[PDB]
């Protein structure tokens, strides 16, 4: 279940916590598009944000 | 005399500047690094770490092992046993059974190579290393399938959890094999490697420095001739109401109770009065008092009456050092006031109390000073002002160190003495000095010290004696002979009537409080209108002298306010009874349906804590068919070979057993217990299965989808039983489970388990537990319990769970039934094993250890 | 405002170099969040139970 009212039907999660073996995990996602190049949507649109766990 | 003069010298400079100095050569700080040795063989060693992580742990493994290893079978050598309880998720292993020789180390699995590699040509040593760098791997001779293959991490919280070093291969003896650790981590010592004479030499040096002060004071002389003086002896003040409040509050520091009320009511007593303070009022009202102290603390055990009698220790040694010319009770003072100051530091009052003496300390050392000076006489005192630097930095190291009775009476006699001292400037009754010193300690010890600075407060009731004796000069100074024959005293009867309301909560036997308040408001409109007309005519009754009657109501209303004794189920499979098989024959009744997740307390959560006993994971089925072909495991007490018993928690299971026997043989069995599981209506502190009776309702001793056995007690019978079972519930889980009862013979508690092998205590629950070998830890190397009486209701646990089998039998409570005993496991061996051999070893010594 | 203007892709990266049981991530895809004040979204007519602390 996810946070923050995240449907799960339309975001993914990932994580790298098992009871199986550790085993030094890591990963590094695809190019993902920043949104335009307007002023008015620098501002009021500060950040950009992950929802992270441990 | 000046002749042996320097000696006083000598024992103090040296004394001080050795006590100053004994935070210095840090402690011994013992070691293990166990090492391996115990000859050649197959010594599954068990050493169990109490902090669950070594340093440094090498092992020198020779691949002359994998040369011979049986397949389906292998583990060349473990830290923890073998199968023991999810040991390979918290300790390292490593092993094959196959072509898959790999170490493991906290499920981390490091170096995974195949049998054919390390057995046979090139390398045959493996040295694996979890040193403070990581955990790595060693396969010098072998190049990859860096070029190296140590293919071991760097992250250094892969130390594993040593309980022993388990089981190895069969042989004579290996090669090298050497594997083990440090065993320790340096956070305790043995005791002071050089100090320990430099501890005796101090205080010898400050005995004989206080020798040397007894010896100096002699131009007064004189020879002190009597014990218990003249001041004393007089039993006439009465004893007995002191003992007799203690005995009262009673039914170790009645010996400190004992001697605080002695102390107080023989020396600070006739001090501050002549045969005023002596008088029956001011001595019965500090008695009376102290008495009243001691209501809150000496019910809940602390150490706080130990401070007030060592503060009041220190007050009377400085008032009898004021009194003669002897220092010599001014450096025990000193020393006494270091020795409450070595308790918990809300012990401030004895510091007050030397503090208070400050003018006259000094007044005397002055008064001496005209014929020797700081050397011989400041010294030795400041060398008695450090003996409990050295007591309380002897077994430390300077590293490893780097409320409405109790106060409100007390400000409530405080208040007026201070007003009616100075006011008057000099009073005819109580002498002028140690009042104001008193009052000096009171005030201080009240405040600035303890109020301003917020040190631990809420230590209510530690006014023990100095409060008792300000009590007494309440008492003495608002007698009606001293004062103003006039409204004062009619208005200290008010304050001290509004202080016994206000304080006077659970407590009722006429109307609630505030009655006595009815008494003080009339009481302040009397002192008015006796301030206005001015009209001894009621003074004996309305001043009331006697301010302590208030505070013998106060005591009143605040006075009038098991490990042996237990059963235990040794032989828990023997002892049957026969009936003459299920009955005629089971209808309603399954030799299946038993537990599978009523296990054997009902712990089907998917991932336990710590705390297990393996019948938790058991398997769910032994597959071997008992008595009424039960291939199902049992409770504690499990002879699946021979014991026949019933369930139906798979409708309305209806079947019944037949008769059975009824056992001075109930003599020594005092219940006989039947071992069922399952839901049933029972008589607590269901379904429907009872004993019956031909020539009953259980008391119900447990959670019933646990294995509840039943209590119904063997004094029910006189000198046939049968469970009748009847399980009307169609659902396919609410049912019960049945057994026939065997021998409930047991033996007693602290006998079976007893006081010599090792028994884990609980979290708390340790009361009267003292029979026991407790569990004790020989500097890093804790001992294996085998006992573990634990709490009835919901990190040494996981360490003895890391190696040790576990299950509860039946316990017992003494004939009270249906209080649950709480719990007392057997914890059993994984495997065969040794005590642990423990190379012991010195020198770990430095400056700045932690 | 980390990010200079001419930046126009970005990609989560994460890392689980250490072995124990307690030391776990997790992600999802970044996200520019559409912002509004709290006076905004919260009106003063919405009853809201404030903690007393604020």
């Given at each position: 279940?996810?946070?923050?009212?995240?449907?799960?039907?339309?975001?993914?999660?990932?994580?790298?916590?098992?009871?199986?073996?550790?085993?030094?995990?890591?990963?590094?996602?695809?190019?993902?598009?920043?949104?335009?190049?307007?002023?008015?949507?620098?501002?009021?649109?500060?950040?950009?944000?992950?929802?992270?766990?441990? | 005399?000046?002749?042996?003069?320097?000696?006083?010298?000598?024992?103090?400079?040296?004394?001080?500047?050795?006590?100053?100095?004994?935070?210095?050569?840090?402690?011994?700080?013992?070691?293990?690094?166990?090492?391996?040795?115990?000859?050649?063989?197959?010594?599954?060693?068990?050493?169990?770490?109490?902090?669950?992580?070594?340093?440094?742990?090498?092992?020198?493994?020779?691949?002359?092992?994998?040369?011979?290893?049986?397949?389906?079978?292998?583990?060349?050598?473990?830290?923890?046993?073998?199968?023991?309880?999810?040991?390979?998720?918290?300790?390292?292993?490593?092993?094959?059974?196959?072509?898959?020789?790999?170490?493991?180390?906290?499920?981390?699995?490091?170096?995974?190579?195949?049998?054919?590699?390390?057995?046979?040509?090139?390398?045959?040593?493996?040295?694996?290393?979890?040193?403070?760098?990581?955990?790595?791997?060693?396969?010098?001779?072998?190049?990859?399938?860096?070029?190296?293959?140590?293919?071991?991490?760097?992250?250094?919280?892969?130390?594993?959890?040593?309980?022993?070093?388990?089981?190895?291969?069969?042989?004579?003896?290996?090669?090298?094999?050497?594997?083990?650790?440090?065993?320790?981590?340096?956070?305790?010592?043995?005791?002071?490697?050089?100090?320990?004479?430099?501890?005796?030499?101090?205080?010898?040096?400050?005995?004989?420095?206080?020798?040397?002060?007894?010896?100096?004071?002699?131009?007064?002389?004189?020879?002190?001739?009597?014990?218990?003086?003249?001041?004393?002896?007089?039993?006439?003040?009465?004893?007995?109401?002191?003992?007799?409040?203690?005995?009262?509050?009673?039914?170790?520091?009645?010996?400190?109770?004992?001697?605080?009320?002695?102390?107080?009511?023989?020396?600070?007593?006739?001090?501050?009065?002549?045969?005023?303070?002596?008088?029956?009022?001011?001595?019965?009202?500090?008695?009376?008092?102290?008495?009243?102290?001691?209501?809150?603390?000496?019910?809940?055990?602390?150490?706080?009456?130990?401070?007030?009698?060592?503060?009041?220790?220190?007050?009377?040694?400085?008032?009898?050092?004021?009194?003669?010319?002897?220092?010599?009770?001014?450096?025990?003072?000193?020393?006494?006031?270091?020795?409450?100051?070595?308790?918990?530091?809300?012990?401030?009052?004895?510091?007050?109390?030397?503090?208070?003496?400050?003018?006259?300390?000094?007044?005397?050392?002055?008064?001496?000073?005209?014929?020797?000076?700081?050397?011989?006489?400041?010294?030795?005192?400041?060398?008695?002002?450090?003996?409990?630097?050295?007591?309380?930095?002897?077994?430390?190291?300077?590293?490893?160190?780097?409320?409405?009775?109790?106060?409100?009476?007390?400000?409530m006699?405080?208040f007026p003495?201070?007003f009616?001292?100075?006011?008057?400037?000099?009073?005819?009754?109580?002498?002028?000095?140690?009042?104001?010193?008193?009052?000096?300690?009171?005030?201080?010890?009240?405040?600035?010290?303890?109020?301003?600075?917020?040190?631990?407060?809420?230590?209510?009731?530690?006014?023990?004696?100095?409060?008792?004796?300000?009590?007494?000069?309440?008492?003495?100074?608002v007698?009606?002979?001293?004062l103003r024959?006039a409204r004062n005293r009619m208005a200290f009867l008010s304050l001290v009537l509004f202080v016994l309301a206000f304080c006077?909560?659970?407590?009722?036997?006429?109307?609630?409080s505030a009655i006595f308040f009815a008494l003080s408001a009339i009481a302040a409109l009397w002192a008015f209108w006796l301030h206005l007309t001015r009209r001894?005519r009621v003074v004996?009754r309305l001043t009331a002298?006697?301010i302590?009657?208030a505070?013998?109501?106060?005591?009143?209303?605040?006075?009038?306010?098991?490990?042996?004794?237990?059963?235990?189920?040794?032989?828990?499979?023997?002892?049957?009874?026969?009936?003459?098989?299920?009955?005629?024959?089971?209808?309603?009744?399954?030799?299946?349906?038993?537990?599978?997740?009523?296990?054997?307390?009902?712990?089907?959560?998917?991932?336990?804590?710590?705390?297990?006993?393996?019948?938790?994971?058991?398997?769910?089925?032994?597959?071997?068919?008992?008595?009424?072909?039960?291939?199902?495991?049992?409770?504690?007490?499990?002879?699946?070979?021979?014991?026949?018993?019933?369930?139906?928690?798979?409708?309305?299971?209806?079947?019944?057993?037949?008769?059975?026997?009824?056992?001075?043989?109930?003599?020594?069995?005092?219940?006989?217990?039947?071992?069922?599981?399952?839901?049933?209506?029972?008589?607590?502190?269901?379904?429907?299965?009872?004993?019956?009776?031909?020539?009953?309702?259980?008391?119900?001793?447990?959670?019933?989808?646990?294995?509840?056995?039943?209590?119904?007690?063997?004094?029910?019978?006189?000198?046939?039983?049968?469970?009748?079972?009847?399980?009307?519930?169609?659902?396919?889980?609410?049912?019960?489970?049945?057994?026939?009862?065997?021998?409930?013979?047991?033996?007693?508690?602290?006998?079976?388990?007893?006081?010599?092998?090792?028994?884990?205590?609980?979290?708390?629950?340790?009361?009267?537990?003292?029979?026991?070998?407790?569990?004790?830890?020989?500097?890093?190397?804790?001992?294996?319990?085998?006992?573990?009486?634990?709490?009835?209701?919901?990190?040494?646990?996981?360490?003895?769970?890391?190696?040790?089998?576990?299950?509860?039998?039946?316990?017992?409570?003494?004939?009270?039934?249906?209080?649950?005993?709480?719990?007392?496991?057997?914890?059993?061996?994984?495997?065969?094993?040794?005590?642990?051999?423990?190379?012991?070893?010195?020198?770990?010594?430095?400056?700045?250890?932690? | 405002?980390?990010?200079?203007?001419?930046?126009?892709?970005?990609?989560?990266?994460?890392?689980?170099?250490?072995?124990?049981?307690?030391?776990?991530?997790?992600?999802?895809?970044?996200?520019?969040?559409?912002?509004?004040?709290?006076?905004?979204?919260?009106?003063?007519?919405?009853?809201?139970?404030?903690?007393?602390?604020?």
């Amino acid at each position: 279940p996810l946070p923050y009212g995240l449907d799960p039907k339309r975001v993914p999660v990932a994580g790298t916590y098992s009871t199986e073996a550790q085993q030094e995990s890591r990963l590094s996602s695809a190019w993902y598009e920043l949104p335009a190049r307007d002023e008015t949507e620098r501002a009021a649109h500060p950040l950009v944000v992950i929802t992270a766990a441990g | 005399v000046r002749i042996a003069r320097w000696v006083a010298t000598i024992a103090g400079l040296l004394g001080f500047v050795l006590s100053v100095s004994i935070p210095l050569l840090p402690v011994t700080q013992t070691t293990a690094t166990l090492n391996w040795p115990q000859q050649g063989r197959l010594d599954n060693v068990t050493a169990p770490l109490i902090s669950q992580a070594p340093l440094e742990l090498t092992a020198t493994v020779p691949c002359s092992v994998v040369r011979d290893l049986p397949p389906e079978g292998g583990l060349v050598f473990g830290t923890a046993p073998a199968e023991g309880r999810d040991a390979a998720l918290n300790a390292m292993l490593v092993n094959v059974t196959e072509t898959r020789v790999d170490v493991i180390v906290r499920n981390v699995v490091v170096a995974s190579v195949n049998r054919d590699r390390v057995a046979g040509p090139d390398c045959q040593r493996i040295e694996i290393t979890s040193n403070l760098d990581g955990t790595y791997a060693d396969f010098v001779g072998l190049t990859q399938i860096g070029k190296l293959q140590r293919t071991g991490y760097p992250d250094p919280n892969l130390r594993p959890a040593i309980v022993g070093v388990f089981t190895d291969l069969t042989g004579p003896a290996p090669q090298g094999l050497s594997v083990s650790a440090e065993i320790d981590t340096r956070f305790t010592t043995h005791p002071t490697a050089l100090k320990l004479a430099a501890m005796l030499l101090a205080i010898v040096s400050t005995v004989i420095a206080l020798l040397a002060l007894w010896r100096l004071d002699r131009l007064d002389g004189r020879r002190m001739h009597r014990l218990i003086p003249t001041r004393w002896r007089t039993v006439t003040a009465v004893d007995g109401v002191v003992v007799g409040g203690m005995a009262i509050w009673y039914v170790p520091d009645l010996i400190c109770a004992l001697i605080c009320w002695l102390l107080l009511s023989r020396e600070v007593l006739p001090r501050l009065g002549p045969a005023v303070a002596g008088s029956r009022a001011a001595m019965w009202a500090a008695g009376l008092v102290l008495l009243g102290a001691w209501m809150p603390f000496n019910n809940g055990l602390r150490p706080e009456g130990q401070i007030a009698t060592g503060a009041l220790i220190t007050y009377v040694l400085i008032e009898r050092a004021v009194t003669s010319g002897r220092l010599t009770p001014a450096a025990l003072a000193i020393t006494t006031a270091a020795f409450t100051l070595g308790i918990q530091p809300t012990g401030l009052i004895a510091v007050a109390a030397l503090l208070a003496g400050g003018r006259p300390i000094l007044r005397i050392v002055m008064r001496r000073r005209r014929l020797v000076g700081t050397w011989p006489l400041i010294a030795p005192l400041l060398a008695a002002g450090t003996v409990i630097l050295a007591v309380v930095f002897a077994d430390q190291t300077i590293a490893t160190v780097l409320r409405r009775v109790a106060f409100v009476f007390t400000a409530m006699c405080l208040f007026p003495s201070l007003f009616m001292m100075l006011r008057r400037k000099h009073i005819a009754g109580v002498a002028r000095g140690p009042a104001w010193r008193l009052m000096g300690i009171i005030f201080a010890t009240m405040f600035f010290l303890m109020f301003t600075p917020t040190k631990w407060i809420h230590h209510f009731g530690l006014f023990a004696a100095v409060g008792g004796a300000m009590a007494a000069l309440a008492t003495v100074l608002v007698s009606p002979t001293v004062l103003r024959s006039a409204r004062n005293r009619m208005a200290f009867l008010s304050l001290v009537l509004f202080v016994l309301a206000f304080c006077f909560p659970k407590v009722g036997g006429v109307q609630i409080s505030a009655i006595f308040f009815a008494l003080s408001a009339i009481a302040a409109l009397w002192a008015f209108w006796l301030h206005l007309t001015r009209r001894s005519r009621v003074v004996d009754r309305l001043t009331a002298a006697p301010i302590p009657v208030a505070a013998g109501f106060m005591v009143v209303v605040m006075m009038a306010s098991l490990a042996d004794d237990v059963l235990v189920e040794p032989d828990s499979n023997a002892g049957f009874l026969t009936p003459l098989l299920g009955g005629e024959d089971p209808q309603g009744f399954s030799p299946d349906g038993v537990p599978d997740r009523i296990i054997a307390e009902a712990i089907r959560l998917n991932n336990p804590q710590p705390g297990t006993d393996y019948d938790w994971n058991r398997p769910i089925k032994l597959d071997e068919p008992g008595i009424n072909g039960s291939t199902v495991p049992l409770p504690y007490g499990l002879d699946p070979k021979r014991v026949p018993v019933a369930g139906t928690y798979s409708q309305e299971s209806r079947l019944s057993s037949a008769w059975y026997e009824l056992p001075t043989e109930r003599a020594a069995h005092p219940l006989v217990v039947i071992t069922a599981a399952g839901t049933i209506t029972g008589e607590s502190v269901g379904q429907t299965v009872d004993l019956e009776y031909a020539t009953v309702t259980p008391y119900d001793v447990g959670p019933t989808p646990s294995w509840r056995n039943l209590r119904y007690p063997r004094s029910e019978i006189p000198d046939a039983v049968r469970v009748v079972a009847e399980d009307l519930s169609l659902s396919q889980g609410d049912w019960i489970a049945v057994t026939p009862p065997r021998v409930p013979e047991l033996q007693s508690v602290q006998e079976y388990v007893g006081s010599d092998q090792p028994v884990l205590m609980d979290w708390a629950v340790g009361l009267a537990f003292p029979c026991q070998q407790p569990m004790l830890h020989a500097n890093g190397v804790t001992e294996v319990p085998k006992f573990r009486i634990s709490p009835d209701y919901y990190g040494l646990l996981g360490i003895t769970d890391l190696l040790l089998r576990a299950s509860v039998m039946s316990t017992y409570l003494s004939q009270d039934w249906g209080q649950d005993w709480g719990s007392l496991r057997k914890f059993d061996t994984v495997v065969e094993a040794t005590p642990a051999e423990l190379d012991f070893g010195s020198q770990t010594h430095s400056g700045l250890y932690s | 405002s980390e990010i200079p203007d001419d930046a126009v892709a970005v990609r989560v990266v994460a890392e689980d170099l250490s072995l124990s049981q307690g030391d776990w991530i997790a992600v999802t895809p970044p996200r520019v969040p559409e912002l509004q004040s709290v006076q905004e979204y919260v009106g003063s007519d919405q009853p809201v139970l404030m903690d007393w602390a604020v």
